[PDB]
Subunit: 388 residues, 4 copies
């Protein structure tokens, strides 16, 4: 077994093809399925896994009341092969209400944060054993990616944040080798608020498209040099913006250096990646709610902050149906590196009051250089008929 270095060019991409769907909420009306949220996907050299943060409870269960709450001591990072729903034989790989995982070519790394809001601990679990940990540095909800980290030649990188949800905060980027934190760089550059980065290998470095919860409905970019540990940052230029909330298609604008100040407060986890000067991105369909999900290529959208010219739109989830978090993962092909993404499909409280719980299922697509059609793949559970 060798270390991955992702030392191949990015595949041609013309759009995305369907890859996986777990139907978790529909199955939970007739079986024992975990309540989850904040799911993500990552793969070893042979095959993909789905992760999510459980709630220490199944759906048809009295302990699913009040599961809208994000941080409890019962929350654990769940791990199955992709397309195995989170049944009772699912492995909890650590204690976590915020997490990140990745495989370096030899073994798995997980970064798992739990404990008090004002004094959380991050544990670093590698090849099936604890190897390091850090405390919260700013004592305000230490939190990480909720998607995969990236590893090159044995060095893995992970973005972490501690501090305000609506003001300046303290973002750091960790470099980790066989579970050991070997370096800590601090966030530098134009990015003013950074959370829940979706990162990908872009040899010889790593790149991340994050969420700005403060003043931006445009999305922060973070660039990580894995050899000298240097960091630069900025925003996704595209006139069509990735966050939710945001302004509409006509009213919106963006900027390659600063946040845009356009209904910037709050946000959602999302993704984007470069293809020459064009940008591939996904976002919720609805501008102010987590309803629907779409992807498109914005022509000249990676370098020109005026560009509003999209092409190759696909509806993933129609605008009448719930979506949520989304993020990227990368898959090594024969000659190239592919990009794929997953979409969290949130159901229940507080937006849906027919049930006392909050949970999600997932749908997953992958880059293709071939051709594709249209459809819509929502959660599809009927909450009027769920547990009593």
């Amino acid at each position: 077994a060798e270390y991955r270095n992702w030392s191949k060019p990015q595949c041609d991409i013309t759009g995305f093809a369907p890859f996986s769907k777990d139907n978790s909420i529909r199955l939970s009306a007739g079986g024992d399925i975990w309540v989850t949220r904040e799911p993500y996907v990552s793969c070893d050299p042979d095959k993909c896994y789905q992760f999510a943060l459980g709630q220490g409870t199944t759906l048809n269960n009295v302990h699913s009341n009040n599961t809208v709450r994000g941080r409890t001591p019962y929350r654990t990072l769940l791990m199955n092969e992709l397309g195995v729903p989170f049944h009772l034989g699912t492995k909890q790989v650590c204690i976590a209400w915020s997490s990140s995982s990745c495989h370096d070519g030899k073994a798995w790394l997980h970064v798992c944060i739990t404990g008090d809001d004002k004094n959380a601990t991050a544990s670093f679990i590698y090849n099936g054993r604890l190897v390091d940990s850090v405390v919260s540095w700013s004592k305000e909800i230490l939190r990480t990616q909720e998607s995969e980290c990236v590893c090159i030649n044995g060095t893995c990188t992970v973005v972490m944040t501690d501090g305000s949800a609506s003001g300046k905060a303290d973002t750091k980027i960790l470099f980790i080798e066989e579970g050991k934190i070997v370096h800590t760089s601090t966030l530098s550059g134009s990015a003013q608020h950074v959370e829940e980065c979706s990162c990908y290998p872009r040899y010889p470095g790593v790149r991340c498209v994050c969420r700005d919860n403060w003043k931006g409905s445009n999305r922060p970019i973070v660039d990580i040099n894995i050899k000298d540990h240097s960091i630069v940052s900025s925003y996704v230029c595209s006139g069509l913006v990735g966050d939710t909330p945001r302004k509409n298609d006509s009213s919106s604008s963006s900027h390659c250096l600063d946040p845009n100040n356009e209904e910037g407060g709050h946000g959602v986890k999302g993704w984007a990646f470069d293809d020459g000067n064009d940008v591939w991105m996904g976002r919720t369909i609805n501008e102010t709610s987590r309803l629907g999900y779409e992807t498109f290529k914005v022509i000249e959208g990676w370098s020109n902050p005026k560009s509003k010219l999209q092409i190759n739109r696909q509806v993933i989830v129609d605008r009448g149906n719930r979506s949520g978090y989304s993020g990227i993962f990368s898959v090594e092909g024969k000659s190239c590196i592919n990009r794929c993404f997953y979409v969290e499909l949130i159901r229940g409280r507080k937006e849906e009051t027919e049930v006392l719980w909050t949970s999600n299922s997932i749908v997953v697509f992958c880059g293709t250089s071939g051709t594709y059609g249209t459809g819509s793949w929502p959660d599809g559970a009927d909450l009027n008929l769920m547990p009593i």
Copy 2:
């Protein structure tokens, strides 16, 4: 690890012996089993797997209401080792209301079709990753085999159809190397309507026996040259015919080149294979309805369209009991290649009104050169008593 070539002679066959049975509906009356249809069987070099299209629901579940509908966003391809029923830890391997799978000797190929009726997408998954996709070419329900594809020297072959269920349609044969469509040939020869092919290796080529939903109750044959990508097609000569519906034994007839025009409308997925100039085949016992299942050898049935001489009949499922789709799969022995088949046992709507759902179980038999007796191995569930 080497590619499969299937370059051994077909094994001597005197009939078929019991191999496997899943008892799925019976178990679902007291456990969490998937609602499914369109099952099949395929084996890696070491062992067999059972596949089926799920409905995104378990049976004892509110969402099983109306599972008679065949194409929904929630349909996924299920995959287990043969004999493990589709319980809640079953892996969904891709999004699909139509699919086909094969192992090339090194890894699994899956072909999965989902999306809108008039603009569906076929995904090609090899060795656990998306490698290609193709759009619907005629915008009328792109669909494929619902049984195993066939690989020789690392080239896998799949038959896909797009277009009318009751008229000329566009059928294509794809050639896939490590998930990648390297060539597309179009249907040629005298077969007029081709659907749901049961294919098998017949060195140095591949051979398929299909369903004609239009004018034929004899079954079409497609022959695939794997090296120069040429196609030829025709029909199974045999005067005892394989489709359902069809005419009775005294009234039926056939033709080696054209559809017989006898009760041709509609059909069922089925199988056949040659033995010198004889044919081994299976079919439902009833002519008009999907009731019972039987196999036999028709003497000179592969070359003589007037032969009605069967020997070695076995009853697999008795005629008072429901059957369904069936198809072929090939298993390599020490000196020779064997032939086996599965039979879908459909239960529930719309034919049975005791329940609101539609699902199946399966029974599987394999070629033998030994001896055997008689029995009947139906589904055996009691719908009068099932959940509610």
Copy 3:
């Protein structure tokens, strides 16, 4: 991987130590567990498996009514690692209402019998594929061991009976190499009625202790020479006899060549093995019904029919609890071959009328050269409190 020769002396045995218990009926009052009967145990070179004939239903399931019936089309052979109860993820390895299994050191052999009473088929499955099959020869309930077969240098042997349950019958010993029946020898010697053999390796051959359902409450012995395929047979000499029913300890007698003719009608699967000229054996404690279970050594019991001298008694299940079938299996140690045994703990109809079903659990013990104590390990379910 190499074939097993079992070419090692038998380990020293002073008695038996507890090895495994699955609590299957106790667990089924609060979970989805298979209904079974006729369990057994066999091990590959690394680990042990539990097998049983399923009834195609779980316990808390309407289909469990009338599971007292021994032969239906829904019965399949279940296979789990020893100590994993038969839950929903359990593999049905073949269709069977009678079976035998063994590993030759390279792969598993399964001998599976299903079909009509008067025309049954025995399937032979080796390394995940059907290699052979044979018809019922006397057209009267073709039946086999219901415990492990034995393989030496790649030739496996198995005992099958077709014919009357209370008269002369046709018993055969088959020689199987990689699933292929290579030779068939017919029963010879003085054994008069032979059923359900518990066989074990005794280099350079195989020995079996079987059930006489006709005239003997002593048990038959069969010696198999694996090289010339010759067969000899007699009975277990011991004055304390192993079948149930039987006469009490003061009234009973035996014969080394003939059935004792003492309450010889009916029987139960049991086991014995030779230690020098003494015999280890188990049996039900109650002489007329399947209640309690016990093991002991009979001094000179293998070579003298007048000996009633037992030493080293162990109670496995106390005389107030239900027992059932029992059989042997052999485990290869560093320097020697150990002998172990399992016991079927039958619950339900007809003997108990508080429930409608009939199932079992199991308890397993192994040979030891060390020391041990006392106890009783019954089924332990409260039928008073089980599902209506």
Copy 4:
């Protein structure tokens, strides 16, 4: 594969970081989960496993009534990968109402005790087969560690006690090679009563920290030489004592050689380990009953019986939440050996009257040389809402 030697120094430890949590009871309110007690953790060279003593029943089950009882014939040792909850697919590796397990680098050893109180049997299973067994020597509840044993260069060691719970008893240390008891040493030195040892490797030997149920609220220590089989014993010097019950922080005292005589009767399994002259130790937070759990380091606590100087306190479970047993295991890093511990969270009878069963879940922490914060990780089940 080579034998583990543990021939590396103990890692730097600044405290403990969160590792695993199973949420067992919370999940049992809406799924099929085993009732358990006396759990522990042990790892093979790749990964960790969780173990427990099942009550031969699930929680939502009539047979869960009165599971407060500690010894029945239905209790078995359960084994899953760490963080996979005890669902119905869980392996019962042996019959045991007391046990210990360990991996010698090549295969697993399990030591399992079952049978009559006055004549129990201990079985020794290695590489999936029974290799030896020994009887109760003093005919009074033969019992062992309830935590991992320790193996060096292929010699494994385990502590067993037989005799009174409130008087002198007979404690022995067994040396086991590939399952074979090769030597038996009797307890020697100044420790007066010894139960449930938490043992760890300390090259070239093994150290244990145990429970004195007779006259000490300070914990016994046992040192074990693996080459000459010698044994020395004493107590944990620390003026802050680890047993429950015990006297308060201000009133307590200890001694390096003899039991302190302070609320000595009864006890709780627990752990400690040495760091130079310091001791790392955990204990329940309440002095009298099993509530809360804490860890700290005592300065000079290992070698000075007067020190009451603690530092580096962590609450693991808060004072208002039930705790229970706890123990140590050890994990091999690149350069050093880490120490981890688990905590049993008991719920139900007799302390909690709302339900009829008695069961538990677990939380698990590992030594870290990095930094960490605060929190509390209780069981989290609401018993008033549990299956009544």
